[model samples]
Every structure is written in C-alpha cells, then in structure tokens.
Target: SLMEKLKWKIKCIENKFLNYRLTTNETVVAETEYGKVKGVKRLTVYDDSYYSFEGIPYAQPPVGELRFKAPQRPTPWDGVRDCCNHKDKSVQVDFIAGKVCGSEDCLYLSVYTNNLNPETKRPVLVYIHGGDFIIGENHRDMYGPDYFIKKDVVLINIQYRLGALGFLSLNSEDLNVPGNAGLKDQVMALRWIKNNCANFGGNPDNITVFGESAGAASTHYMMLTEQTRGLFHRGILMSGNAICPWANTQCQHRAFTLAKLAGYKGEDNDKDVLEFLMKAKPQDLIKLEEKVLTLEERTNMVVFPFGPTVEPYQTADCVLPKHPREMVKTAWGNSIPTMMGNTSYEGLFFTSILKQTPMLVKELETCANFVPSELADAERTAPETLEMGAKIKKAHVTGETPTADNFMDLCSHIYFWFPMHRLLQLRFNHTSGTPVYLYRFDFDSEDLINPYRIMRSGRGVKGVSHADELSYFFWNQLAKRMPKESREYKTIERMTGIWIQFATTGNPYSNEIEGMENVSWDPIKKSDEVYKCLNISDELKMIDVPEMDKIKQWESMFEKHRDLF
Candidate 1:
C-alpha cells in the first residue's frame, strides 16, 4: 500500500513538473518586450531540475469592440496575473453534448521548462492543438508536457480563437479583417514565445513547432506564411498534411458563404458585414449558423465557413499578391526542417462519426446537384475507372452514390489519403533544405476496443483510423489491446520516441537510441517511387502502391469543380 501510494504521488508530481525545470515555490519574474510575466517553480518527483508556468496570456481579449478583429497585445497588470490555470477556449459548437467551456479572452499559453536559470538555454517545443479548426483546448490532458519534460525540453502549448468568432472571413471593409484571424493569433503567440521564452530557461532560436490534424495543417501554414518566418527551427505534422480540399480556394468560398449567411448582402464592400458580425452576440451567431450547417455537415461542403484565408495585404505587405497555393509553392519558408505524415485511416473517424455507408452506381446518378454529368457517365460505365471527363470528374468525386460503403472509401481517399501523398510529393520536389520524413500508422483497433464497433459488422475493418495513433503517442497504454511485453507495445514506444527525438533535434532518425532495427526511413524523393510504412508490430517497410497515382486524377477533379461552390 505504501509503495502504491508513493507511485501515485510520483505520477502526480511528474505530471506537474514534466516541462518545468524549477521547483514550484521558486518564483522568477521577467520583463518581456510586451510586459512583465512572473513564473513560479515546481519540484520534480525524482529531484530532477525542471520548472513550469501555466496560463500566460499572450494577447488582449478579442471581445466587445475587438470581436472579429485581429489580436492585440494584452495589457499588463500591476500584480502577478497568476499563471496557473489554463486559458479559456474559444466559443465552439455543441458537437459533443454538454455545456461548452471557454471565453473570448482565451488568448493564452502555458510554458514548461527545465534549467530554470536563464543561462542554460534549453530547446523549446511549441504545440498547437487540432479540432478541425473549430473546437479544441490547450489543456487536453493527453497533450500535456509530462513525456517531453523528462527529456529536458521546454514545452509551450497555446490556445487560439476558433469557430466563426475566430475564423469567419468577410468581404466588407468595416470588418477590414483580411481573414485568418486565428492563424494571426497563432503567429502572435509564437512571437510572444520568441520574445519571452528565454526568461523561462528556453532558447528562442531552437523552437520546434508541432501539431496534429488541423493543428498539423496550421503548422504547415506557419511554414508557408511570411509572418512566421524564422520563428521556428523545426516542425512535426502528424495525421494530416499541407494539401487538402478544405485548405485552398474552397476555404475562400466558404468564407464568402459565411458572410452572406451571417446576414451580410453580397455587396463587394465587407465593412458593413464585419461591423454587423462584430456586434452580433456570440451565442446568437452560433445558434443562427447551427440551423444552416450542422457540425457534422460542415466538412462535407467544398468550402468550410471557418478557417484562414488569403487576403490582399493582411498576410503580406505586398498588394494583390499570389494565391495561397502559389505562395506556398514559390515563397514558402524552406529553411527549417520538417517531419510530416498521416495515419493510415484518417477518414475512418469521419465515416464512423457520420455513420456513412458505401454507395452504389444507381444512387450516384440520383445525386445531381453536387455532381456533374460526365462524372456520372464514368461512374455508370466504368465505375472503378480512376479518370472521367472534366465535368463528370467533379460529379464522381462529390456526388452522393448508392454504394454507401464504397462512397465512404472514396470520400476518405479524396479528403485525406491522396492529399497527404500529394503534399509529400510537393515537399520532395520543391524544397531541398528541409528534410521530410513520412509514416503510416497501421495499428489496428481490436473488436473489443473499437468505440465504433457497433456500426461495423462486429469486425474491426477500419485499420488505424483517424486519431488512432493518438493514444499511442499520448502514452495511454491502457487504450491499446497489446500487453506491455507485446511487439506492438515496443513499436509504440519506438514511434513515440522518434517523435520526441525529432522535436529535440532536426533529425528523427539519429543513431543515439537503441533497439531500432530495420527502421529505414528515407526522405521522400521527387519521383514518389518509394515511401515508408509503419505497421502494427512496429515493423517499418517500403512498398510501391500504384493506387497513389490516383492523386493526380483527384486533383484534376477538384480543380474542375472549383466553381460549383
């Protein structure tokens, strides 16, 4: 009993001091370029040297008159602001049933570090959370710094605005907000870390930015944005890639629709719309929009009503610059090293959540609105043919078909599979300086452990679905079916270790660690001939899958249907 109690106490202490290098009682206050912030010390369970400061505000609350506007610097308070609790989360839709938590004043960050003394200069890991650019908080227990703190790395997690309040774009001059306010909020937070991390025993120059899903996309956007240049040394993108249907022109159309739905006329000037949105009550706006677009249906649209946009001068000083894709291709910051990959079944999460079934050809022809004529013809004739004529291609991709199960697979391919493959190709072909490592998490969910087992045929066919790798990375060992001594367990350890190592150093495949045999992770080549795959038993291998060739076909389809939205 005594030993058990000791273990629990140790875990609690370890969790608290994982990212912190100093004792809880030791208080150190430093003056930043913006204002003065005081951080307190916390002790390590093993008497290790580490410290942490939670809930540091980076920007002023974007509420009242500040609503729908870019983030402003937070005002300094006379006394210590008490950096302990998590900052508020932005307002979100009630996707999961319950009372929502967060406030407009949610622009805050948490800091964990070792080497409390400023001279030590430790590396920093900055994390961004993902909730489809709509929902999430920095305080998700799994994302805490417990595992990383032991490695002596300083960790910082930030909370940015979400939903319409954080991302809705307008065409009005009154709102004059060029869009991507949420991304701007992230840039501001990184700037804050760059300016003030040193006071907390972190080296600003060695910051590594990492995230998963929407967070991963945001990380890639940071790489592409000129405003975030030189802010980070490296990055880790998991379970999502830079290229996606939702990330480009689709996002722009969604913003335009959001403006119109929010009661703004299609007047070219967006100022009136911006002012109207800013003054609208947050709850009222969310409730009104909820009627038009259910949370589940939001992702199905070609354009998402929320997320970053390519504005004229808001992103860069240049007037009427290139589109987001062109800028990403030509001007993206390639100086820093990046590690990007996706889970094997990223689409499973959406399919399971929506209870979507595959569709057949007869049903495909019935869906006429989103689907064009030529695509329907291809589906009717050669259903499996990867290519159809221009107009028909869009119809095939977006059209709802009778084959529920097959359609789910197609949707998955369009949304995640091919986009990630294309992103890897782009990175390999375009950037020479940045090293890219690719992976596919193939850990399957057992029948008993499958949360969506009820929807399936009592057989878990959704292999390594979306976010399946999360439990492993978070060290939630109990979530898995394998025993501690099992091969899968060892593989989880190895994969997580590689992630941590990559965050610490630019290279993830360094030879310092032991027991990593047959792990031949090669950089993606321009030809896209070979890519690494991580399987269930922690096995790593390279295989050539001709199915990847379908990406070009899908890209063409997306381009043809670009105007439909």
Candidate 2:
C-alpha cells in the first residue's frame, strides 16, 4: 500500500510533465540580498525552458504581537524550506458554509515558473483572491500555477489577512493601527516580491497585479496609492470598480462598537480594554459580535461593517484627495495599462436574492445606508413610494411582458452596470493614453442556473452572472470545471491566455490562440460609448451601454434630493 501511494505520487509528477520533458529533481536554489529560497524543477518544450518553485514564504507571519501591525520581512531560513503546501489563511469568520483552516502566522506566497535560472528574467503575474473583504485565500485549486506554467510566464499567488482579523481597526495604545491592515499586507507582499523575485528567475521590474471582486477593488486602490505606484506595471480588474459604500466606512465604526461592547467607557487611551480584547478568544468575540449584530441599530452599515477603509496616510493625497471627484479627474499614472470589465447580469447576483426577500422594499431602504444618502434616497425611495410595490411593477415591465424587467429596472442600474460604466468614463476622462480594455462576460454555465434566470421567467437561467467568469480565470477547486475537451474548457483556455498575455504585455490580443480570429478586439477609446461583449462560445462584439447612461441620470437626480426623496 505504501508503494502504491508512492507510485500514485510519482504518476502525478509524471502526468504534470505530460507536455514537457524530464529534468533533474535537483531543486534550484537562489539567494536574495535578504535570504535564500529553493524551487522545484520541470522542463517545458513550449518556450524551451524549465519550470520550478511553488509556495514560497516572502514575509514573516504577522501573528500574536505582530497581529494588526504592518508586515515585517521574513527572517532568513537556512537550507531548503519546502516550498510546497499553501500558507495558512488569516483568521476570518467563514461566511460561507465550510470549514476554513488558517492561523495568525499566515503571510505566505506561491511561485511558479517555466525557467528557474537566475539569468532568465520572465514577466511575473501576481494574483490577489477575492471574497468581498471577508473571505478568500491563495490556496484555491483553481488558482494553481499549472496553467501559467504551461506558458512561459512566472506566477505568484499571495495570501493576506481577511475579515475582522485582517481589516478590523482598533483604538488603543498597543494596537493603534490603520483600518486597511489587509491592504498593507498586500503592499508588503509586493515589496517582498520586488526585492526577492529576481532570485527565483522572475523580473522584478515587470510585474502585473490583478484580482476579482474585492480583489479587483484592491487592484484599483493600489493603482491609486502612492506606495504601490512603482510596485506594479499593469492591472487586470474583474467584476468590481471603485465605489465608496457604507461597507467601506463601517470598518472604522465597528472598532468603536467592539470597544463599547467590551465594557470600555474610558477615553481612547485606555490600555486595559485593549489588553482584554487582545486576550479574549477570537471565536468568543465573533459569537458575541454576531449576537449584537442582530440589533436594529446595529444592522446599519455603520454598526456591523465588513470592508476596506480609505486610510488617512495611504489614501489621503492619493485616492481620497481634498475633492474626491477631482481626485479621479487627476491622472496619477497614465503609462500603466489597465483591463477592467464586468459580467453580464452582474447585478443579478445581488438583486436575485433581494427580489426573493419578503420585505424587499424595507430591506432595500435599509441597505440604502450602504450608498451615499442622496443616491440611496433617489434610487430606493424616489419616483415611487415604498408601499407601492404593486404600482412599481408597471414601471419595470415592457408591453410584451407582465412582470418587471428585472435586469433593466432593478439590477443593472443599481449595481454593476452603472457603477462600472462610471468608473471607466471617469478614469478615461482623467487620464490620456492609458490603454483601458473593457469587456462583458456573457457566458453561461450548463450545470448551474443563475438565480436571476430563475427569477426572470426561467429563460437562459444559467446566463453569465456576477462572479461567474471567475471560474474560467482562476483555478477554484471548490467550483466545478468543464471537461478539458468541452467548449467551456476551451473558453477557459482562451480567457487565461488573454489574461496571461495582458500581464506579460499591455495588449490582451494574441495570434497564438485558436479562437482569436479577426477578433477585432479594440481598446476602449475616449470616443467609444460601448463595451466589448464576450459570450459562452467566445464570440466577441461591441454593445452600446445605454443602461449606464440612464443610471447616471438617475444618480444625478438622486444626488439633487439628498435630504428628501
């Protein structure tokens, strides 16, 4: 049995080399100015190169006394530290139904490459996982290095702090830190990569940062931050854009609320309360916080918040300038290329759940706190009374259909469709010669139905929805993947190729892929008022964004009536 298991492992290693030749399993080791690291070895025929390394620790774990503080450089280790198993994820309350394993000492990274020679300087693609601000890790199987390794590009995936343990800010002498600890962790990781990547056969000068959802938000934030300016050269933002919400602000208030709940009534300088909180078990605090979250007042975004914050030091001159809108008007880095896009029915994911709620109107009004007061009043309360759900149905329906036009009236304008369009227009207007690529993933999965489809007459219920495109881009072990020979499988290949290409070079189009025909993929010019549309079969075209315009009108009207709807 032991021999059989060993054979299986050997077989797996052999299978991984199916497309390549055998090389010395002799680990390739390198030394940076700071420390040393060891990488595995494999030979690839595509680029006539060798691939090596995985799961390399770049920073010391920020646990215990180091918890809630900025990241510190990892201490140099002697000999070969096994660069295999994924690093532990930071402490986060599992919002999804599953067991999550991680510890405070979890700042680790995974590396992959087609060449391990110190002289071979290949472009590096670094990815940050997304789960709002609450979940996600670098260990997901879907995000493995297998795909990128097949290509010549080197890949690195990072694990950072998440949820309360990662982002929660507190007011105390011992733990007086900024709210965006998770972001700082990311910055530190980039610093580590810049200083140490060259030793592992990566070009520290050519780095591309990318992510989806909250990860995408983080990418955009990093682009705007002064600290991250020289750390990366390109960005790929999927599914999320820059929009301030109560979720972002509530992180600060949550700290204050936690202190009050802990029976601390003194000035902010009190150290006893800080000690009590630090000593209190994390699980116990999470349970108590969940109970207090049930209170009506606590339900507001200000009370039970879970998101990023605009820090005074990191964001002041960079993202949160004196005039917020003016900040977007000013171009910080015009030379950096960016790829930003959203999926079809992006808002459907959130709206589908809202429509199913019994008190949809009440919940919508309550959740309005997540948006600016003016925009919230206009969008949720204006042009219709909260009690007029029956009458509001007429405004949402076309003559051909009886029920509301769910996508147009409820979902699209409220969330993704509008917010993303505004983000593009503003960013484009602010900068010149910044190549911005826009896309809309309209692909649909065969096995699962998008909740929006079920809610909207059941036609094409599996159409592309929020976060659906991620399955094709990232290696998510939790998600089901299409068979390698299937069309969706091909789409995965195409998507990954485009992303990798973009990371290596500014342009996403490549002639090497089979499906890339006269594809005619064009960058978003200042004149174009449309987005590139991508379907299940990989057919690409441009579509007008009228929904975005209408939402802008609605937002403007909403702002005008900030005090009253």
Candidate 3:
C-alpha cells in the first residue's frame, strides 16, 4: 500500500508538469550566479505558469559594520535557497505598517517571469518605486505582475534603503555615511540584473528602467551616473526629475541637525558621535523627520526630509560625479531614450499641509518665500521670492484675496509644472540624437474614490492630482485589481499597453493600440520653436505647451538669476 501511494505521488508530479507543458524532470529551480534558487509557481488564469522568485539577496546584509556604506555583493550559498516571500523592507515610516517596521538586511530583488521558457526571452522592465525616497516598498501587492506578465515582459521590482538609514550623509571621515546610499542600492540591483537576467528568461542586453516621482527621479539618476554607462539603455521618468528643487538635499547640515536631536554632545565630526548615530535605533533617527517637517512649515521651505544629496568630491563613500544642474546643462547622460511628464494638477500632492495645520491655505497669500531651502536659503532674496509668488498668485488666483480656492493651483505650478518644463527644455536643447516624449496626465477617472485618494477633496481642487496618473497604468489603492467592464477598463488596457509597448520597442507609438486610433505623440527638437506634447485626456490629443502663460513667469525668474541657483 505504501509503494502504491509513492507511485500515485509520482503520477501527480507528472500531471503537474504536463499542466505547465514541462517534463516531469523539468522543474522550477534556477541557478543564479551566486547560488541555486527555487521559486514558487503561480498559475495565471490564461493557463500560463510563471515562476516568482522573491526576496533573493543581491547584497550582504547592511547590519553591524556595513550599516551606512554602499552595497556589497552577496556571498555564494551552499545548497538550494528558498525564495518564497520578501520579508524585510528597509526601515522607514510606513503609515499602514506600524511607525518603523523593517530590517537592515533588506537588500533584495523580486523577479516575475515565465522563467520556464528559454525561447520566449523577454525584454525586462526594472521598476524603482517612489515614496519621496522615504516610504515605499517593492511589495508584491503594489507591484504585482499578475496583469503585466501577459504583456510578454519580465518585471523586476527592487527594494532600497529608506529614510535616515538610506540617506543620512555626513561625508565626514568620522561617520563616512554616503549620501546616495539609496541610489547606490538601486544601481547595484541593476548591476545584478545585467549580470544575471539571462537565466530568468529576460534579455540582459535589452533593459528599460522606469519609476514614478522619486522613483522617476532615481531613473534619471541611474541614467546620469557613469556607473551604468552601457548597462541600462532606456529610462522613463514619470513625474519627477533630478532638476526638481527638492530632489537632492544638503544632507550634511541635515545630518548635523539630526545628530543634535539624537543627543550627540561632541563636535559633529567626532568618531564617538558617529558611533552614537550608528548605534541609535532606526525609529529614533526617524523621529527627527517629524521635527524637520515642523521646522520647514514656518519658513515655507520645501524639503523631502531625507533624500539624495550632491556628494563631496573628497568623500570616501557614495558620490555623484557632478551636480544635477551642471550635468543636465552639459547633457551628461541624456543619450538614453527618455520620457518625462507630470499630472495636470501636480501640486495638490503637498496639500496635505492643510490637514496638519489647516490654516496654511489661508496663510499662503504671501506667495512662495523660500527657494527649496536646501539649495537657496543663503542665495535667494525675499524680494525675488515674493515677486515670483505674487506674479503667480495674480495670474492663477480667481477671487480677490487668496483662499484655498486658488492656493492648490499655486502649489501645483511652482513645485511640479515648473521643474518638469525646465527638464524638457534642457533635454531637447542639450542632448544629441534621442526622442524625448513629453506627456501631461489629464485624464480624470470615473472612479471617484481613485482620484480623491491622491488629491485633497476641498476647494481649489483642479482636475487630476499627483500620482493620479499611476491608477490607470497599474493596480494600486486607486485602481481595482482588474478594471471594471466599463470605459475605465479600456483605458487601463490602452495605458498599460502603451507603457509595455515602449518597453517592447524604444518608441511608445510604434503602432496604434486601443486608445491611440489617431494619437501621434511628437518629439521636441531644436528645429521646432514651439513646445508640443501629448495631453492624454478622456480621449488622447496633443496640445502645445500647457500653462505657457504661467510657465513664462517662472522662466523669466530663472532667466534673471541664471547662474546662482
């Protein structure tokens, strides 16, 4: 009877193999460069079976001595390594998952593909998530490959360090915490993919890097850095760019402030001080972000509490070769095929400031006063700031005195619209032979809950707000798991199809898809004086540079103070 049971199990195994059209001997284990890894098999509804390898370490744990430094490749393991679930997220402030809940050993990459197919080797899309570089995970729920896998592309979602653990930089000999540790983490993941993606039914040579907001900005960082010279070929910057005022910060000063808050009495450069910092609990270090946010409110200084910084040339650890403006001006790494854009009303992202104090809407009549405090606290003047803000208020504000009504538009223009416009201008003018496609996310969803999830509900609510663009492209809190059988679902099919089309070919409009019966997205060139871009609305149409009248005011301000900022 026992022997009969064993043979029945063998029959079951053979049936499972046939279900995936594989021989009984052929199974789900793969041999990566480091070691052998076994992935869990998930069957799709279309009778397709794909392998999902999760929480595979690309780097050694950043615990103990490795805490704040750049990544180190993980050592080879002995036997079969089970890659079942991604457990440890980089320690940071997660709204849903308690205040501080993750680990230092959190450097991992999750890959989803039809790994069984050696013949259908697909182009890879490495997604870097955006959480102001502080709060995001490459979690399966948020970045699930359930929908995108059918598009015939292998999806890779990678995790990096966050908050102070990821971004704190003294660049001091005593501390030696590199500023771009988070960026470096992403770079290392790319390095791993370049070396090892071929085994997972992914073509290593053909790879596209994409992200939204800080993730988008990080994509720009990857393209800009020489470390990825020929490694990554294309980049899609969804809603952020390196030129955004708050992308990179003065981490040294912020580090000093944090050290003081954490009870370091010695000089900022002391080794004992660095020891105290390294020893401090992750939540303790993160407590300071609350303080920094409070400090910036009174000053009207926009700062993403902990973020990327321009590294010191003389520093020992993570460093960018040059500053962002200088790099963009000279067209440093613009050769990669580029796509960048913003949502129609991007500034409502920061309207959460109203929830904190609520009077900020009524108090913001002074216009913008600070120049992204990280870069221009000492360089800018109140006269110019007031002039810029007043000009903006005069144009956009509808009623006599400023209320929350016009304040939303005011915030959206300066923070998002201004930076994205400048990035496009620089790329078209400075770069050589590549297509730069610009898009303005203008579609408002019929799903009322989706848009409101991103935007503030009250007065001055324009159309779509920051991250509203994301709902259409992927399954998120805003988007249902599967699109409803309505006009909304067709947009999802077309939107995701367009995105995957770009990753499939370098051009997004190679051939028309569902939504693009007549939509031809044109490129910006030195030959064309007028700005032309895709205004993706209920139905797609192209429009000449949006908010041009409002844009000129910020442009004029920048033209006057050309060199300093």
Q: Which lDDT values do the candidates have, in the order given?
A: 0.60, 0.59, 0.71
Q: Give the candidate number with the greatest lDDT.
A: 3
Q: What lDDT tens digits, residue by residue, belong to model 3 across residues 423-477?
A: 7766666777788877787877646233334234423455677777666654433
391-505 per-residue lDDT for model 1 (tens digits): 3334344444344444454555666666676566555546765777666666664622321222222234656656656655543212323565666555556665777677767
Model 2 alpha-carbon drift over 4 Å, by segment:
1-26, 41-55, 95-100, 118-120, 170-175, 244-247, 259-272, 286-304, 312-334, 351-358, 361-372, 376-409, 447-461, 478-485, 531-536, 545-565
What is candidate 1's TM-score against the reference?
0.76
| Segments in model 1 whose C-alpha atoms lie over 4 Å from true places | 1-32, 35-50, 98-100, 118-120, 248-269, 292-300, 312-321, 353-405, 445-462, 475-492, 512-514, 533-537, 540-565
Give the 10-residue window scoring lowest on summed lDDT in candidate 3.
18-27
Tell me each candidate's RMSD, in Å, in order: 7.3, 6.7, 8.1
**Against the true structure, candidate 3 has what lDDT?**
0.71
Model 3 spans with C-alpha error above 4 angstroms? 1-27, 43-49, 292-302, 314-317, 329-332, 362-364, 368-385, 446-462, 477-485, 527-529
For candidate 2, the per-residue lDDT at 7 reads: 45
Model 1, residue 442: displacement in angstroms?
A: 2.0
Question: Any residue pairs clashing in model 3, and if so which?
Answer: 347-412
| RMSD versus native structure for model 2 | 6.7
Q: Is candidate 2 or candidate 3 better by TM-score?
A: 3
lDDT tens string, model 2, 307-401?
56654444222233222234455535445898877776665555444556535444333233334343334445543333233333333334544
Sort the candidates on TM-score, descending order.
Answer: 3, 2, 1
